[PDB]
Amino acid sequence: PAYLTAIEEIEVNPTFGGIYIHTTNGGRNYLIFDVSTKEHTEYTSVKNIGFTLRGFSAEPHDFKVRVRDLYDNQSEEYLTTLTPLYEEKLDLTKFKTFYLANDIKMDNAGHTLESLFNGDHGLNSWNYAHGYDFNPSEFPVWFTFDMGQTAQLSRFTSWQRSMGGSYYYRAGAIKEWEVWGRSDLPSSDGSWDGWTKLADCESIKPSGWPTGSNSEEDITYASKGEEFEFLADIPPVRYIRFKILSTHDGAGLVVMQQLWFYGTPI
């Protein structure tokens, strides 16, 4: 019966501010998960069941899970005591360029990719990592770096190159991208085999004004850092890629100022 396989194969792991519950359901049956603390009901029929409860402090808490079906069957309780994950800013000094053969180069104009992790950021900053021009027909493009440790990621903050603000939302500022990762050594050829997608991301321009016109709200917003959250169902990772799909001005050029990552080191 699906509800029995569900309770028998269940895994419950800590995640940021709660727990991640996963189980199997190869029949695509309709299961109801009731999750108790001393708080949520999931209604799902996917094959690879995975869902989160959040809102919890990072200390040990007792959790109870029961699975039921639309036929009035109900499982034994699964009990677990788990501590939710709590994020820290990962140590920037361990972040390094990890250049693979099919990556864009980010060492133009006197800087390197590792400039994105040197701490220098904000409206008046001249810091950046700066690529080379390419034809936008070549999007998507990507670059690769090493976090220098393995971590369960929560979120990251991204700053565009600024130089007083007029460079926001043009001149290499990225618009949509994906963040991919892996925990084991990449292949030197830059093959995408062995990489896992971790986040879909879109940098928002609050005003929605065309290229070359930035509002006061746009400039304040970008200078404060753009925040993105990662998927809960991701493995620990060490190596990271940004697969750039688009840029704000549509030109084939990537230029950014800073990237700070948050999560729990392994």
Numbering used by the authors: 128 to 165, 174 to 401
Publication passage describing the model:
BT3158 crystallized in a C21 space group, with one molecule in the asymmetric unit. Diffraction data for BT3158 were processed to a maximum resolution of 1.50 Å. Despite performing diffraction analyses on multiple crystals and no detectable protein degradation observed via SDS-PAGE, discontinuous electron density was characteristic across the majority of the N-terminal DUF4959 domain. Iterative rebuilding and refinement of this region suggested that it is composed mainly of β-strands, consistent with sequence-based homology modeling as an FN3-like bundle domain. This deficiency in electron density across the N-terminal region and sufficient size of the asymmetric unit to accommodate the domains was similar to results seen in the prototypical SusE and Ea domain of BT3700; thereby suggesting this region is consistently disordered and likely forms a discrete domain that would reside close to the membrane and have flexibility independent of the rest of the protein. Beyond the membrane-proximal DUF4959 partially disordered domain, BT3158 presented a distinct two-domain structure, with backbone residues confidently modeled with the exception of an extended loop (166–173). Structures of the DUF5000 or Ec domains (BT2857C and BT3158E223–P440) were compared via the MatchMaker in Chimera using the Smith-Waterman algorithm, yielding a RMSD of 1.225 Å across C-alpha atoms, and a quality score of 0.768. However, this is where the similarities at this region stop in that in BT3158 A304 is in a structurally equivalent position to D304, and none of the other residues between these proteins are conserved in this region suggesting sequence and structural divergence that could also reflect functional variance.
Herein we have identified eight Sus-like systems in B. thetaiotaomicron that share the feature of a homologous SusE-like factor encoded immediately downstream from the transporter/lipoprotein duo susC/D. Two SusE-like proteins from these systems, BT2857 and BT3158, were characterized by X-ray crystallography and BT2857 was further analyzed by small-angle X-ray scattering. However, functional analyses with BT2857 and BT3158 revealed that the SusE-like proteins exhibited galactosidase activity with para-nitrophenyl-β-D-galactopyranoside and α-(1,4)-lactose substrates, that has not been demonstrated for SusE proteins. Using a series of domain truncations of BT2857, the predominant β-D-galactosidase activity is suggested to be localized to the C-terminal DUF5126 domain that would be most distal from the outer membrane.
